């Protein structure tokens, strides 16, 4: 019901469960979705540590800053994407919600800061920000200023001016167990034969076999120099399987 | 050879019309190859194609299966299954109309 | 938004009924238009939906093989026939609009514009 | 399904707050229950979508609630304007259906 503003965004964690990317791709309902290092086509085959959620309330004209490499007001002083950032930028027009009649000031956004955000930096201070060479003590008035201001959102605004409500999807992909994957069912395990395989995101081609490797509880995989996985766990039998090639 | 392809769409969605774009145009109606030689010309047409109340004759794809290819063309009305029940041509929950 | 619908009628037993509902303010084909009935004194019952995009429609058990309904974009309206009059088919009709199933927040289930209702006599 | 709404009969004075109830035969989602007001000699207007969300132009001085079986509308102070019939609306299995109202 209540989106934050982009000044103070929200971040939600998700994980140890299935994703369905497709039922919001094929949604006719989003003005903006866009994927960086990843296409939107393939989400529902991959498997991730962990998917962050972030959302706010921007104006229109803003949701070209959501991406990276942008500048502008919001990309340096409010939400700053990496420039590395694999994840989906996901915005819809909210004006039937957002707007009122005389404006709605309870979205706001930071116009003032003494240098730009790092990637996923958050900032909800109020101090006073200098912009002459005195100081300001806290006091408002010449060269210094209060550092946020409000969007004021009408219903008569023009499209640029309107509220957007924006979700970023980042995605999470360490050395370490998927706890988010998509839909896809699995089949029956096929050894002793040249197979395509997908262990948990982990796509190949080769032979597989039952492993004299003894490997820890905490182990999913092994690899050779070079960065080849040679052995994998099976994520529901817990059996070990060497990878040989055809 | 020349070819030239022809269409009416909304201002926002000119960017579309472009190599390596996305979007429901470039996605489900006309989609541009990556290596493409060619120009995109394009004017506002709203003295013509406008009218008081709507002109509904214009026309798009909503939702589609897969992309499109490039150059390739969809002029099929079929139901879209959105949900995992089949659909047996009739329009209702998670069944579309695709245009 | 607006929905305007046309005047009162009165019919015989055994006959046949059209009601009309012109729409403006909005894209006529984004939304689905559906027809609601309350006989006198009693509360709401709703009859079936019809996308003037596909022209499809979709019709409450009571009503099936007795409405028909339809509409024609060139002048944004739809249309409601009730066939085989009976006396107990006397009220106020109503065309109200509602989202399409395909939206993502589910404005499909709930009527958000009404027309001011068509009483029919039978 | 079958939508039952309670007190069929509400009468209190101007200025004082009123709550009606919605009990559904079986569990409806949060989503598909909404409320209708319907003045004297009008058409129903909507109030309330998504058990908890206003219309747009309906005065703060409404607020709804529930779930599973159990709703309720709730009007903090009421104008003379709001002495009017109200409806609880459920969809599901691709069908629309109301309570039988009740009158403040």
């Known amino acids: 019901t209540r989106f934050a503003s982009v000044y103070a965004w929200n971040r939600k964690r998700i994980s140890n469960c299935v994703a369905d990317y497709s039922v919001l791709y094929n949604s006719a309902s989003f003005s903006t979705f866009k994927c960086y290092g990843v296409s939107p086509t393939k989400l529902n085959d991959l498997c991730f540590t962990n998917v962050y959620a972030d959302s706010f309330v921007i104006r229109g004209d803003e949701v070209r800053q959501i991406a990276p490499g942008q500048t502008g007001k919001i990309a340096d002083y409010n939400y700053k994407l990496p420039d590395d950032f694999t994840g989906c930028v996901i915005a819809w027009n909210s004006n039937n919600l957002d707007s009122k009649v005389g404006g709605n000031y309870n979205y706001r956004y930071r116009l003032f800061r003494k240098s730009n955000l790092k990637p996923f930096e958050r900032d909800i201070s109020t101090e006073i920000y200098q912009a002459g060479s005195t100081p300001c003590n806290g006091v408002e008035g010449f060269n210094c200023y209060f550092p946020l201001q409000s969007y004021g959102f009408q219903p008569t605004n023009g499209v640029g001016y309107q509220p957007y409500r924006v979700v970023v999807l980042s995605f999470e992909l360490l050395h370490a167990p998927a706890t988010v994957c998509g839909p896809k069912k699995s089949t029956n395990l096929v050894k002793n034969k040249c197979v395509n395989f997908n262990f948990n995101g982990l796509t190949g081609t080769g032979v597989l076999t039952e492993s004299n490797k003894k490997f820890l509880p905490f182990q999913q995989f092994g690899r050779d120099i070079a960065d080849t996985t040679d052995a994998v766990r099976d994520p529901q039998t817990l059996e070990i399987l060497d990878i040989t090639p055809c | 050879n020349v070819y030239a392809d022809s269409f009416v769409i909304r201002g926002d969605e000119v960017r579309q019309i472009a190599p390596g774009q996305t979007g429901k145009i470039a996605d489900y109606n006309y989609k541009l190859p990556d290596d493409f030689t060619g120009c995109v010309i394009a004017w506002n047409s709203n003295n013509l194609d406008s009218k008081v109340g709507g002109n509904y004759n214009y026309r798009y794809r909503l939702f589609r299966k897969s992309n499109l290819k490039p150059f390739e063309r969809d002029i099929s009305t079929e139901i879209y299954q959105a949900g995992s029940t089949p659909c047996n041509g009739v329009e209702g929950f998670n069944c579309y109309f695709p245009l | 938004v607006q929905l305007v619908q046309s005047g009162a009628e009165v019919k015989k037993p055994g006959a046949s009924v059209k009601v009309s509902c012109k729409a403006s303010?909005?894209?006529?084909?984004?939304?689905?238009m559906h027809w609601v009935r309350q006989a006198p004194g009693q509360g709401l019952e709703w009859m079936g939906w019809?996308?003037?995009?596909?022209?499809?429609?979709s019709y409450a058990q009571t009503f099936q093989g007795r409405v028909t309904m339809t509409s024609d974009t060139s002048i944004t309206t739809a249309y409601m026939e009730l066939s085989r009059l009976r006396s107990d088919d006397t009220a106020v009709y109503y065309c109200?609009?509602?989202?399409?199933?395909?939206?993502?927040?589910?404005?499909?289930?709930?009527?958000?514009?009404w027309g001011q209702g068509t009483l029919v006599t039978v | 399904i079958v939508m039952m709404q309670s007190p069929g009969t509400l009468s209190l004075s101007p200025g004082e707050r009123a709550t009606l109830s919605c009990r559904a035969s079986?569990?409806?989602?949060?989503?598909?229950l909404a409320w209708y007001q319907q003045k004297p000699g009008q058409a129903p207007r909507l109030l309330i979508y998504?058990?908890?969300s206003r219309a747009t132009g309906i005065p703060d001085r409404f607020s709804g609630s529930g779930s599973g079986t159990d709703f309720t509308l709730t009007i903090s102070r009421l104008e003379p304007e709001d002495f009017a019939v109200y409806y609880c609306?459920?969809?599901?299995?691709?069908?629309?259906?109301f309570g039988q109202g009740t009158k403040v």
């Open positions: 109200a609009r509602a989202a399409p199933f395909y939206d993502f927040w589910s404005g499909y289930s709930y009527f958000d514009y």
């Open positions: 609306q459920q969809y599901g299995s691709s069908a629309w259906t």
């Open positions: 079986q569990s409806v989602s949060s989503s598909y």
């Open positions: 303010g909005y894209t006529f084909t984004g939304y689905y």
């Open positions: 019809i996308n003037p995009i596909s022209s499809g429609t």
């Open positions: 998504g058990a908890s």
